[PDB]
């Protein structure tokens, strides 16, 4: 679990969105596993606007943060799950690091701010849904 709170927006994994997120929907994209909903309170998270390929992510299944080197956002084949059929997920960044299903939503950050959230994993890999291209989160 986990979300990004920036301005009047809440960014979560689309497969973990609640009834309230869908009732306050701003934008969603199944191909990216992202959903954004509106909030009444102001969020103070900062979104990175950079091309960093290193950062630190939070791993809830270890209660620890880990440093990572990750690939540029790209289209990656993801196996079928109870939430989606087998498909290419876009804007996904892979890295070597521990992750379990409940780790989805953990933030990846670089020195410039929030880069994305955990969205896939397995066998010593961790994949992050990028949010740096969503310029409207601030403007
Ligand atoms: N973005 C997706 O399609 C997710 C949906 C939930 C299931 N997906 C996963 O990768 C996983 F949860 F099974 C997993 C396994 N080990 S670490 C993680 Cl994260 C794909
Ligand atoms: Zn950066």
Curated annotation (Swiss-Prot):
Superkingdom as given in the UniProt entry: Viruses
Coiled coil (UniProt feature): none
Name listed for the protein in its UniProt record: Protease 2A
Binding partners and assembly: Homodimer.
Reaction(s) this enzyme catalyzes, per UniProt: Selective cleavage of Tyr-|-Gly bond in the picornavirus polyprotein
Chain sites annotated for binding Zn(2+) 1: 50, 52, 110, 112
Positions of the catalytic residues: 15, 33, 104
Biological source species: Coxsackievirus A16 (strain G-10)
Part of the intact protein present: 869 to 1007 of 2193
Stated role: Cysteine protease that cleaves viral polyprotein and specific host proteins. It is responsible for the autocatalytic cleavage between the P1 and P2 regions, which is the first cleavage occurring in the polyprotein. Also cleaves the host translation initiation factor EIF4G1, in order to shut down the capped cellular mRNA translation. Inhibits the host nucleus-cytoplasm protein and RNA trafficking by cleaving host members of the nuclear pores. Counteracts stress granule formation probably by antagonizing its assembly or promoting its dissassembly.
